[PDB]
Amino acid sequence: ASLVASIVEARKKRTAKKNITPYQRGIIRSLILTLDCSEAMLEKDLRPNRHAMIIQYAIDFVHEFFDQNPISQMGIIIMRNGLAQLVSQVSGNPQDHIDALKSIRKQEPKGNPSLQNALEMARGLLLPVPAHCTREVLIVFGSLSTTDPGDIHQTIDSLVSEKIRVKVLGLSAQVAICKELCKATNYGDESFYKILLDETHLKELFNEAVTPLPVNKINKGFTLVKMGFPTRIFEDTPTFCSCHSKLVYGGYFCPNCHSKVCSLPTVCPCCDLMLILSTHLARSYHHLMPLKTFAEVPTTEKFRSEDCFSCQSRFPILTSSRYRCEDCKQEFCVDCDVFIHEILHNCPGCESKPV
Amino acid sequence: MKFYIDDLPVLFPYPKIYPEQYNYMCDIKKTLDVGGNSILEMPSGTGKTVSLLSLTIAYQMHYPEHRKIIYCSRTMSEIEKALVELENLMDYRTKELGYQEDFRGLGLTSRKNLCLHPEVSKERKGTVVDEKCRRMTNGQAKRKLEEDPEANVELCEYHENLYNIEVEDYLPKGVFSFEKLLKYCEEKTLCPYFIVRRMISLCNIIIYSYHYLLDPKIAERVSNEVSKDSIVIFDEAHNIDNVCIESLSLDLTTDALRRATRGANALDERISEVRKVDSQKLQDEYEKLVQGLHSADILTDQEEPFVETPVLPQDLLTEAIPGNIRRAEHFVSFLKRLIEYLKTRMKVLHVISETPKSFLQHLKQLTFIERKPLRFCSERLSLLVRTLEVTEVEDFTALKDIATFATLISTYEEGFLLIIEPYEIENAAVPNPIMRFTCLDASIAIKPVFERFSSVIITSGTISPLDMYPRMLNFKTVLQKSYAMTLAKKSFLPMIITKGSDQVAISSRFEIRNDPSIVRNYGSMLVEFAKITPDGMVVFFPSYLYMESIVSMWQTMGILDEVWKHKLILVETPDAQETSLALETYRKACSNGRGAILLSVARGKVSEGIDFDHQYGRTVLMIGIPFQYTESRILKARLEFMRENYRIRENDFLSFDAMRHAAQCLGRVLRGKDDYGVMVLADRRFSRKRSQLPKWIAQGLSDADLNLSTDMAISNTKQFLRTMAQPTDPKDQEGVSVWSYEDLIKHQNSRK
Amino acid sequence: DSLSKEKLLTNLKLQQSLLKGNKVLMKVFQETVINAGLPPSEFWSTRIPLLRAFALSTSQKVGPYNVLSTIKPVNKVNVNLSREKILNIFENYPIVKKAYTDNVPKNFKEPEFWARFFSSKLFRKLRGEKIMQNDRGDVIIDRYLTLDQEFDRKDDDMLLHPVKKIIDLDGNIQDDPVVRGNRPDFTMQPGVDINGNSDGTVDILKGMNRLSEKMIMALKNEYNDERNELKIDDLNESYKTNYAIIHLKRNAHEKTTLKVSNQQMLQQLSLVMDNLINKLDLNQVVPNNEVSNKINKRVITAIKINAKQAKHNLEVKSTLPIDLLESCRMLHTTCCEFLKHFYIHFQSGEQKQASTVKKLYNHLKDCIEKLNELFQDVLNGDGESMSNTCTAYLKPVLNSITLATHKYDEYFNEYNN
Ligand code: SF4
Ligand SMILES: [Zn+2]
């Protein structure tokens, strides 16, 4: 009787994903993850302790964020002992923040949090940020309270005025002030103050936070942006780099001012212009071109085919596991449905079918 | 949203509605059709006031009777709540119809709440406030200033402007809040008290306290300008018997006796001086008493009676003053020998309890004072004060109290008793004797109400059982049923903590009160719930002394220092003003989310009109059974009388009252269905009382919850927080809990 | 406040502060302004986010907390004092700050003062301890008892404020000023001692309430509505996102900077199906060892070329003298700084930038000549043994610099000429 429970669970899951929309979603991102390292995360209540798992999950979050969206800079400020401590400036290299987080590994989480100080200096760090960049902050929190020097509502008003959004991933339960932050910052939405139920749910939440977010019509900033593809050289001689001032065998060359760099996707240090590859911009095209869900045909009706169109395996036989791409009119197995919907970003049935 | 009942158009200011609200409206309209009274119990977590107000407004507009509306509550807080919701409803109706209908409705309160005379405003005793207002606007002051503008007896310009403009010119139509009335009277320099006193005949709906309906002194005026065939509704008056008891109960202290002696001497010497300088006024008063005129006969409206009418007007004496007290000196000697008799009875050595008839017989045995003068005393004293012009009335307030006592005890004999005990404080340095007047019944004061009005609605949220109130009060209702909680999912999680962390039971008994182990348990789960509580938590001990002991000795352990590290702690001050500042602090602390804890008595001033919601109502630490003080002779006499009357088990009634006070404590968590909260029961003895408990409360009380400890209480509370931290699909409640207009239509057809 | 570009450039002390924090910033700044004489405003003009980050790092402060509750009494006692917590006590209790400042700089020592403080009954009163005449306290600290009492009175006077009638329990209890009932229970009223006086638990409770009020008014610092307050949001319309969807029109330009026939492909197709069904031999695939030898030549040539590519797969190891290595790295660094500032001036595009562009052009020319003179030095220091490698190492920045000079000259001829 487990298949009936699985079917009704899949129905209640798919009721949320019935509506799939091609919203304009931010690509030039600006993501900040502040960390609290206080007495609450010293609890071993989840194995091994909250500090260790948020360290590991932040490592994964950095990797996933830079993989999916390499067109953003990442800054991390830790919270400790009534002080918020900047440990990671916004940068294109994830490895810097990886090393900073590795420093955070060995040190000891202790103290009390101050979202006022944390969000204030996060605002100040987010101040010299260009218009197209979408300023947004992830906040992790384990306390049920917050010691603060002054008002939080002035900070809330300033953050709303400066067009920065937040998303809170609280640990224990809901905190009303964090609900207020999420609602007021997020145009009244309640889809940003999220509480885990276990570590797997925390993993899923982090994966959800990886994704780009849609933007609002009223928050209109539709413009152009200057761009430059550089050229890579492979020289015999080591050559001084502009950024780190040291001898480099290879390195890209600046398309505009003909200097050289060491890493991409990065902006020029000399002509001060952003340099990318077409792979980097095409990386988010699945977000730009979403994929429709695939429908299982019912077991009662007559079937177009009895084996999987894509992976080429036999469909198993009570119910019918034939997920149909209505855009290509072909049914598929669950494994292929998962792979095409998540890993792949094209429908080979729609590739074979001519338009 | 707007729909039709069978003949009744009705508008709701929200697109959504609850089926429980629909059944509530159905039964209320059934009661209004059939005439009389009914008792309905509803879970207070659903919206009540807006629904009943909408039904009443629709009833008055649609039906050609257009009967007025009488709604009464306990506090200014509840009154302001009703005002705000009424304003919202009528605004919505005005928007829906596209025009404003003619409407009038206001509240009723004290000059201490209201008198905007800034000089009078700076006093704290509302009695002093009212007395000063009489002193400078009593009409006598106005006449003296009119004949002599050089006289330095000023008049209240607010009152002067209200003299200038007319009663309909006082306000535009509609409903105005206390704050809106403050702004309006600030603009126009008007006395809102006087305004309210002239709005009485004109308001379509009138709202005031239960005291203004129960106490005869502040109720005869309300009965004067009220329509007999209006609509009467009551809300959350399931503890109104206490108000009924204090409506006709009185106490006597030594210092009050001293003040009465001093006031009588001052009045006697004033009367001697007046007889020396001009006996014309005294002779005029004496001959007016020979004709037998009364307070309404002689006094006008702008002057007020000094000794207000202590008894119900159905029982007053309306004949002439006897000649034995008719003269001023005769009445002074009368009062003085009454004082002397009270001083003789005053010095007993133990507990004395006799019938008022026996007291009267003893009095007429010793002195020679009869029930007719002993009733006429208050009226005669008011007339003597009016004639005497003794407006420096400081020494004579004890005289008012003693005349009130004399009139009250000379009025009734059954269901009333006098208690004399030689100690005001038993456990003091010295005993201090006391006379305590009581009213053993409570249904006395409701008789004018029931026999003056038929369309009277008695309903609440935490009334259980329904039949016990017609048992305790001689009245009957047309239908008696409750409402179950039609809940889609669980939102309230009650627990019964019958044992501590060490599986050690806990109780609130005053003998075992100073038990260090029970302290250790209490502080233990107090700490644990403080650590796991996100936003706001309240604690309700049964008694203040119980607090003061147990908080001082946890202060000795320094547990409060640990509690400091997570939330603030707020304690019910004996000052209501400091308590108000404290609750504001709690409000702002839960507003900024740094978190705070309230400490208030189960019967304390917080518990009777303050709600807590969505961060304020999140978790409550009810402390033990809130039993009353056991060794009250007053309570025991009540128990004897009610058992003799209605065959009531005494311990069962005590559990009932405890019972009902606990429900009043715990009912202030769930404002809307979106809210959630957890309930604790911190006594072992509560497990037998789920059958007593209200039905919708106990329906969430599962059988596994009947005996729990700290550990699974903590685990279940954490899991409840985890549960309530999740979103919910609207499809699971779109037709079973939240109803659209079409949902209500479909339900109505299904009923059809 | 201290947030403008002008404020950050003005704070020379903060500039010196993070200067002294770093060491390569002395190196860079010394070469930039001490050695090259660049305008230090334009030096700091790049480092504005770094300056603001340093400022905001230095600028934060903690929130208030119950420091006396965190004080523990801890046989004997050893003072283990923390200066930040000492100042926390000072800030939380200006009376204790005053008692420090009129006694320690006048009469005795700081640890002696704090021992007297912990001994004092004023400490117990200010903490959650009931005062007792059995305790002797410290007389010097306990002289401040009445001063702290009148501080409490003044602070309570400050803390008084009018209350909203929506929640005013004073208005609630002032509903009926003529309530005449019975005296309430000793149980549920504030109890007193034997002689009628209080124990003082009301004093300690109002004191901790005063602490809470002082907290919340410290929050409430420099740094009608009931309609909104009584809204019932549970019966209201759900919020829906106004997020805009996006479509995509698709019309791409063809790639810019003989035709087969169906009959002919069908004829070939018929012929090759005939060949397919006809025969297929694996053995004929073996080549002729001569054209195959040319394939060997091509493959081996590709291997040699890409292997020389792979032959040049901390920086690289070099045989430079370390001092000259540091000097040339320094020159490269300051040349890069000059080039970046010149590009900042050039891409700015103003007539106000003109003299700056000209002067930085002069500086770039000077850097060019200094590079050449350095090349003369490594010339007569090596006999061009590895001075060639020095020139090649400094080459590409020189090429970019001189390219920028040519761009400047070309735009000068474009506009002026
Ligand atoms: S005249 Fe009006 S404002 Fe003055 S004391 Fe009387 S009620 Fe108040
Ligand atoms: Zn480099």
Ligand SMILES: [Zn+2]
């Ligand atoms: Zn460049």
Ligand SMILES: [Zn+2]
């Ligand atoms: Zn497949």
Ligand SMILES: [Zn+2]
């Ligand atoms: Zn397809």
